[PDB]
Amino acid sequence: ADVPAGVQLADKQTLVRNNGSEVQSLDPHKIEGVPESNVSRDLFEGLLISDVEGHPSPGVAEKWENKDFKVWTFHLRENAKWSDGTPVTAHDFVYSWQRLADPNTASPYASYLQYGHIANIDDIIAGKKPATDLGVKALDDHTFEVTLSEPVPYFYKLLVHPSVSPVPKSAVEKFGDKWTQPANIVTNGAYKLKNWVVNERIVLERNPQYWDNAKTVINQVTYLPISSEVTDVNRYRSGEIDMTYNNMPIELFQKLKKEIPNEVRVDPYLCTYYYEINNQKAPFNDVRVRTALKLALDRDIIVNKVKNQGDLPAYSYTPPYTDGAKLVEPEWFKWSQQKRNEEAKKLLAEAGFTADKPLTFDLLYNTSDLHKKLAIAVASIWKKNLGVNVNLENQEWKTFLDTRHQGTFDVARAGWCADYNEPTSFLNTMLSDSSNNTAHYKSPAFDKLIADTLKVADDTQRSELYAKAEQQLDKDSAIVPVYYYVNARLVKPWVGGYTGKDPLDNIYVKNLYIIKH
């Protein structure tokens, strides 16, 4: 943290953050969500990290070079260490990226290496080549070299993500799935794991072996697993919680803006809220059905009547304010809702649905006040506008993600947040073979458009290709875009260091501090 001249620090430097749900895991190779990544940035540090405004900055690598954007050389700081005092080396990164690529690890983020195009990744994922053929090598203990199959000018931006953080081979090998328990875990971020009580709390304590430990101010941070946004706000206003999770409740928000304006932080956020359709499951494998659901959802009502928290109605998957996004707003989004409803009704009538044999399906969402209220509203809107019946089903976060990967569900509530600020951080998830493709969407035309983006050496042609890829997604009604999120949360007046300037919201507790109050 960089404490401004003149601020008086509190005697006790402890922080309590709500984290939205119980994490799936603390293993960087087994996680995919926001809550997981929140804890992951405090414990495991990769080659680069985000600074307080979100700019990619030195992490374990102090400096780096590239040759033709295809060979990237990272110079690792000599004093980078794990919490047991041992050095973090380039061998740790070789092992870790191999483990991430290895199909036996079954990481949800195995395709992150395809997104960066590390050499030989496709064959490794397919089981055609061993993970040791991955295009990474340690040239020495402090030098990590990555070789890609084609120029990727934004490659370094991907490196702040948890999936490419290092993991300690000896703990993984000796303890297997229990390597992340407090007694066994070894970490290289600013914090160490002190306590992990499932569905109660995660408590982290400062890691004195961290190379930048002298700048760390918070000594202990607790992450809570509260999925009820109302309860989160309640425990924040009671004094227990210092920073809520950034999912806000419909019951109280309007009230909060009026009652505590200075504590309500609302900043840009590169995330899209949408209803994920299982594209491989009839009758959702019919574009007419999917298009009807997309058109009959009334975004004006959701965004301004039922939620009204500053979200913008969405018509795409990639947020239009992503760096590099120049999207074409489709004609259906400018229509009146009445016109969208008649088109939807006509497609559904064309697909075979009648009043006597209506379309009935499930709407899966993870436990949440917000998601429940929004799914009840969406069910009502679809019932009134299109005559479809939906059966709401809630699941806890970890189960919910498992269900979507299992891919036999019908429609699921969904939200994707950028991992790096560039449209492929969204678009690569819809590639036929992506490990993150829970839409189960497979379009050869879409895949080709994205493949073509690194075959041009021009940002203008790349942007035009991303716009066409979004148009192809839209044409196929792969998803139901609802709204672009805003990062809205409460932060006590005494919490310093949270700028809200990073649109990816990659917070590091090592950057925060408690002001005397």
From Swiss-Prot:
A single GO cellular-component term on record: outer membrane-bounded periplasmic space
Expression induction: Part of the opp operon, which is constitutively expressed.
Coiled coil: none
Tagged with keyword Signal: yes
Subcellular location: Periplasm
Summary of subunit composition and partner proteins: The complex is composed of two ATP-binding proteins (OppD and OppF), two transmembrane proteins (OppB and OppC) and a solute-binding protein (OppA).
Name of the featured protein: Periplasmic oligopeptide-binding protein OppA
Protein species of origin: Salmonella typhimurium (strain LT2 / SGSC1412 / ATCC 700720)
Gene name per UniProt: oppA
